[PDB]
Design a protein around this ligand. Structure first.
Ligand SMILES: CO/N=C(/c1ccc2cc(OC)ccc2c1)[C@@H]1CCCN([C@H]2CC[C@@H](O)CC2)C1
Ligand SMILES: [Cl-]
Ligand SMILES: [Zn+2]
Ligand SMILES: [Zn+2]
Length: 309
């Protein structure tokens, strides 16, 4: 029998049927399933089991693969894998999606988004899982996302919360956003964001509107105008409270629709390819135009410098 924490460095161990896996190894999982209360079977010899990082070597390996120090991570990860592996991951419109189960609509929408933006995860667990998931095997990636976000299967989620959590574990250091807020009493004031903060915004969905200028409260009492001075990033995420919004073809990359409230709701994913495709888990519907309660819109960027002198 073998044990590991990353499924990359494996360790050979001893087969003894009298003691539960929990008494010999500690908490043990086989392909997600909690076998801690189980004693070893004759058919298990040679398989790979996961265990918690109790050995100092396993601590190091788990940190290098998952980029977290949380001891419970693996536990949570494995618990999530017990469900994500049962889900169906149909190909829909050239992307990997999830047939609806366990309120996963936010997860399916985040999954489709991740497959359409240029992102480079730093943790190897995530890089490996990402490439597997882009090809259709997305159980591990979804379990890892649930784990990194401290969400459980069935638990309610926000697509923006998920994307932001994950961006933290991505190489966005080269990203840069220069803004300029212009109040008529306070004057002009410029700011520069780098990293994760440069690729997200909250307040408006329209990126063209962010470039033209958006009204925001100022402390003096007036409304100030914030406009985008410079964007250096592979993508940009714009969020806003759900509202009826008209997605025009060729003007965005993809978008999150949300119907419902803080208690109960359902997420749909819209993407602009050669026309507007609406991916509701395993369901797909095409349309030339789309109007819906949008809350996230994702745009592609390379380098932008404002024309406002
Ligand atoms: C009722 O939804 N309102 C929302 C909201 C509010 C204010 C916002 C302000 C923004 O900045 C200007 C940007 C985005 C905003 C989004 C979200 C969007 C939909 C998904 N989440 C989940 C959160 C966990 C659980 O409660 C289920 C819903 C709620
Ligand atoms: Cl409802
Ligand atoms: Zn002011
Ligand atoms: Zn309800």
């Amino acid at each position: 029998v073998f044990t590991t924490v990353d499924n990359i460095n494996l360790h050979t161990q001893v087969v003894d049927m009298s003691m539960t896996y929990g008494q010999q190894f500690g908490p043990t999982y086989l392909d997600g399933a909690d076998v801690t209360k189980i004693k070893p079977h004759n058919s298990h010899e040679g398989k790979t089991f996961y265990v918690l990082p109790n050995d100092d070597t396993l601590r190091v390996e788990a940190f290098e693969y998952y980029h977290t120090t949380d001891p419970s991570f693996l536990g949570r990860y494995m618990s999530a894998l017990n469900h994500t592996k049962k889900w169906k991951y149909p190909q829909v419109n050239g992307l990997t999606s999830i047939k609806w189960a366990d309120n996963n609509s936010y997860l399916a929408t985040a999954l489709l988004t991740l497959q359409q933006i240029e992102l480079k995860f730093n943790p190897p667990a995530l890089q490996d899982a990402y490439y597997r998931a882009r090809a259709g095997e997305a159980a591990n990636f979804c379990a890892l996302i649930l784990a990194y976000c401290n969400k459980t299967v069935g638990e309610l989620g926000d697509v923006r919360e998920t994307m932001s959590y994950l961006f933290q574990h991505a190489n966005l250091d080269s990203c840069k956003r220069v803004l300029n807020v212009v109040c008529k009493t306070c004057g002009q004031q410029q700011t520069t964001l780098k990293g994760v903060e440069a690729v997200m915004y909250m307040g408006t969905l329209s990126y063209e509107q962010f470039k033209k200028g958006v009204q925001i409260p100022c402390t003096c009492g007036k409304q100030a105008t914030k406009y985008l001075v410079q964007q250096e990033s592979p993508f940009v995420m714009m969020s806003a409270p759900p509202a009826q919004y008209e997605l025009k073809h060729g003007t965005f990359t993809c978008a999150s629709e949300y119907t419902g409230n803080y208690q109960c709701g359902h997420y749909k994913h819209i993407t602009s390819k050669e026309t507007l495709y609406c991916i509701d888990g395993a369901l797909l519907t095409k349309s030339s135009e789309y109007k819906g309660p949008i809350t996230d819109v994702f745009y592609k960027e390379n380098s932008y410098t404002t024309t406002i002198k």
